[PDB]
Design a protein around this ligand. Structure first.
Ligand SMILES: CN(C)c1ccc(CNn2cnnc2)cc1
Lengths: 412, 412
């Protein structure tokens, strides 16, 4: 019968910092991690800025010899995973290694590496493709390499659900534990899609903000002057652990994961429906899964991408799910500061939701100068709002109409 | 407790045929789908052959215009899925669409699209990248496009566990139904990595057979003269259904899915351990999940890739798990005929395991001319073997040390 799941460790790389506390400091201070991209020449691109990880040192975690073989999305996923495991205080032993697994996902995976090897193939032939092209680029290799380095022999897999990946990865990992398939899971996601094909491909869809001359103001969820999402890189990992297993080893418990919802819109390849019907179905699934009255919800970490249709669909969904209580909860988009980490978005935003519970503060939606028509909820405009938070919800919505909702609450 | 899950619909594209019955007819006749790859300059490559899908007509499924937006791996996944749903006879309605979901995965995803868009980018800059590059290349778009086309509102996701994808996709979809999150799931995988990058990438790791003079003899699992796997394309999809749901509408039930195991080797990025310890834990997990004794297993669809180390690890794992019953069961690699469909391997092999149960016959391992040292099990060399099969296992062991096992049982 279904066991309870708590969060005992967290790890992160974001545009705001090389760990959780540094990133959260930036979140509570309203700081933007968005800047013109320095790592390649984007003068021919319509978008030339994004949320880069600044000053990442892979040699805090791995040999440079092993790092050279791995796409940045794998290096980022391993860094966040290592941080989460260390933060948990868990010791991997012969007695528990079969009960500890990993589900770290990505939306796009090793596009930089695949692009670079495509370059080698086209210009020089197949004999110049890296021997490590496959294991250094495919999405399941965060889970694979983490298992090899720490000796995790539990369920080992990866999700890829576009911008929903980090949320689904955490929810499904919690089900593994809830249903007895594992006692511990390291779960989350990682992304580094800031290569020619990434920026070019989202550019070709006219999905990205083109505010090149004021990049810190580009990400403006629910603002009337928003013009698309900001592309961002990084990773989030959580250690999920069965409650009695956590109690039995004296673990520090940050919060309890009480609810997980999924739904499909079945509407459009890329566009969300204006009424947010699939997001509403997903949130209602999560709240019923958590055994909650919707009025218990205090804080929502929105998907809040800064797209015209996505932002307004989320307002419509929250009003539909929460009715008059929609005016009492606080909802913010931390993508206003971090930009959109795609497959890692749900992983870092799950961490932000847990820290909202720990610190009793709703992070701001920065850049919300002029809320759009019908965007009249408490969206925590400009500045962090200290408040009572017993229940926090984190939403993600992605291409294919794929929705995820996580429900966290304080643990006593 | 837990609901029972049965298979009510199957769909496939393989190197043996454009549907299940054509493919299965090839399998039972010991036919090879392996041939030199056409309409592709493989001059500079060490491997020039594989398992292609022959004569696929996407306009049976999609308009030309909608097909132009999608990588071949997505087309293949959608074709298998549509076939599976048609085969099931299921009627999607407003009363049941929230209970029907999708989990179709891929190991490598849209290499062909990435290749062609790299060519645009490198030759003409980013403004010539297709607007549909991202949604037409990402792995979750088989689930996405299927959910949109058929109006499926249930759990919508995609696994990516390299060569284990199809097995994990089916197993996790079965968990959704068993634990009441859905009544129907479409599950499986698809792959089209026969581009320069796939043949080049695996070739750079010298993972592929280089038997260019005799492509149909290349895939020879457990044969002393094997020299690595054969790269193959296609897709498998199953309709998984809660038993009472299937009986209420008078569905034809092929077989019951009674067990699912997962494990991690935590050993090496690409090679399994010599003793197959992780594959043994995974099979034991799957049998425990099914409440079955190893002695009850009749037929194993091996991973059987024709790699020196992988083939021998599976022999060791089966001797360890099955002890005095290890010789009584039959174990065969259908990869001897199909080649290795990577993320779709476990999907087509689950279908072959179900058909082994329907027709009471172990498919052959062709090309098994000289068993290697210690390969003395009943490997069904050369020709199909009619026999009693109540319980059939299907195993997948992929990069990252990720393992999956499915347990199917005859249904009456
Ligand atoms: C591998 N080949 C030969 C290749 C690589 C990059 C470029 C374009 N960017 N570049 C970098 N260094 N010079 C130009 C052109 C050809």
């Amino acid at each position: 019968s279904r066991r309870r799941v708590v969060i005992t460790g967290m790890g992160m790389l974001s545009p705001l910092g090389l760990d959780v506390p540094s990133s959260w400091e930036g979140i509570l201070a309203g700081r933007s991690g968005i800047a013109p991209i320095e790592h390649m020449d984007l003068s021919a691109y319509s978008t030339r800025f994004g949320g880069s990880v600044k000053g990442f040192n892979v040699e805090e975690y791995l040999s440079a010899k092993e790092a050279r073989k791995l796409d940045l999305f794998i290096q980022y996923g391993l860094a966040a995973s290592f941080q989460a495991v260390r933060d948990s205080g868990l010791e991997v032993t012969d007695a528990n290694r079969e009960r500890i697994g990993v589900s770290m996902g990505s939306g796009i995976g090793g596009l930089t590496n695949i692009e670079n090897n495509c370059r080698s193939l086209f210009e020089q032939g197949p004999r110049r493709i890296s021997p490590f092209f496959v294991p250094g680029s495919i999405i399941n290799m965060v889970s694979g390499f983490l298992s090899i380095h720490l000796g995790l022999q539990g369920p080992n897999y990866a999700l890829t659900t576009a911008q929903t990946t980090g949320t689904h990865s955490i929810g499904m990992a919690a089900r593994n534990i809830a249903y007895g398939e594992a006692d511990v899971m390291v779960a989350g996601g990682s992304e580094m899609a800031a290569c020619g094909l990434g920026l070019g491909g989202f550019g070709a869809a006219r999905a990205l903000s083109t505010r090149n001359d004021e990049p810190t103001r580009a990400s403006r969820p629910w603002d009337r002057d928003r013009d698309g999402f900001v592309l961002s890189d990084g990773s989030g990992a959580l250690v999920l652990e069965e409650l009695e297993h956590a109690r039995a080893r004296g673990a520090r418990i940050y919060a309890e994961l009480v609810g997980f919802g999924m739904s499909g819109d079945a509407f459009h390849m890329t566009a969300p429906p204006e009424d947010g019907a699939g997001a509403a179905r997903c949130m209602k699934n999560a709240l019923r899964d958590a055994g909650l009255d919707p009025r218990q919800v205090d804080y929502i970490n929105a998907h809040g991408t800064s797209t015209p249709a996505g932002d307004i669909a989320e307002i419509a969904a929250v009003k539909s799910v929460f009715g008059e209580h929609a005016h009492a909860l606080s909802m913010s988009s931390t993508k206003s500061m971090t930009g959109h980490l795609l497959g890692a978005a749900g992983a870092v935003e799950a961490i932000f939701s847990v820290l909202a519970l720990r610190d009793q503060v709703a992070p701001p939606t920065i850049n919300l100068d002029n809320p759009d028509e019908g965007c009249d909820l408490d969206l925590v405009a400009h500045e962090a709002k200290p408040r009572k938070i017993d229940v926090a919800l984190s939403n993600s919505f992605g291409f294919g109409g794929t929705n995820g909702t996580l429900v966290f609450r304080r643990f006593a």
